[PDB]
Design a protein around this ligand. Structure first.
Ligand SMILES: *[C@@H](C(=O)N[C@H](C(=O)N1CCC[C@H]1C(=O)O)[C@@H](C)CC)[C@H](O)C(=O)NCCC
Length: 253
């Protein structure tokens, strides 16, 4: 039976990644962020907390040849296939500089007010695939790789998505991003105004209902100043902006 609400941060609080919001910076790497966040969560959840890792967004973004155009956007299935086949090393944000390959780009404000420099309009070029851990990290790159066993698309059915998240952990999901999404501050989003800006990829961590209105609870990769402390909610059950139609995940065992 599916509960009225679910929050992965509450089910698996030993796994620090689940409540961590990241910042993709001035790069169209949402595809890689939703992937390594949900892979970090699932590596911990599915290993009973043995793997406590923050997986490197830059390793996936820079080294997966089949995942698309890097800082110009990517593709979800091949990202999870790369995790299964090649694996991904560890790496934190630029500012924290922990792990094998921390992210090279700084935090910035994405279409919203706050204390970080504005992201502005320029996009960085995709970083090179360097295959080298930072000097202080004393595991060689190939030996820091964490690999999945399987990956898959989740059925485009609300209950199937809920069951998947509650049993196996947060999922990555794509949706169509329209101009009014870049004005989101709080609440339950639905597309009302603006034209399409293409696809966006995020991490669904749970669901809930407020004033009879059902929603998905989602982490964006635009830092903690955007939205509801980095999260947003979106209508659930009506394939709003195709949110139930592009769900991808995988398992380590
Ligand atoms: C998703 C992605 O990264 N989208 C972009 C984005 O979020 N950016 C680009 C610059 C910084 C950040 C921003 O706008 O603040 C942008 C196109 C959203 C409007 C990426 O394009 C992707 O991989 N999409 C396909 C997912 C299946």
């Amino acid at each position: 039976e599916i509960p009225s609400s679910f929050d992965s941060r509450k089910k698996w609080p030993r796994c620090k990644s689940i409540a961590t919001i990241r910042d993709q910076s001035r790069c169209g790497s949402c595809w890689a962020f939703g992937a390594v966040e949900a892979m970090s969560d699932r590596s911990c959840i599915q290993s009973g907390g043995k793997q406590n890792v923050e997986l490197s967004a830059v390793d996936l973004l820079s080294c997966c040849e089949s995942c698309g155009l890097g800082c110009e956007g990517g593709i979800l299935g091949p990202a999870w296939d790369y995790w299964v086949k090649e694996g991904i090393v560890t790496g934190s944000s630029k500012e924290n500089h922990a792990g094998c390959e921390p992210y090279p780009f700084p935090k910035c404000e994405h279409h919203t007010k706050g204390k970080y420099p504005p992201c502005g309009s320029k996009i960085y070029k995709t970083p090179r695939c360097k295959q080298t851990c930072q000097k202080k990290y004393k595991t060689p790159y190939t030996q820091d790789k964490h690999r999945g066993k399987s990956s898959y698309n989740v059925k485009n059915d609300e209950k199937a998505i809920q069951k998947e998240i509650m049993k196996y952990g947060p999922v990555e999901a794509g949706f169509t991003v329209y101009e009014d999404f870049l004005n989101y501050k709080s609440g339950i989003y639905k597309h009302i105004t603006g034209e399409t800006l293409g696809g966006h990829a995020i991490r669904i961590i749970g669901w809930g209902v407020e004033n009879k209105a059902p929603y998905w609870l989602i982490a964006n990769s635009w830092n903690e100043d955007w939205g509801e402390n980095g999260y947003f909610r979106i209508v659930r059950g009506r394939d709003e902006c195709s949110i139930e139609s592009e769900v991808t995940a995988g398992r380590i065992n």
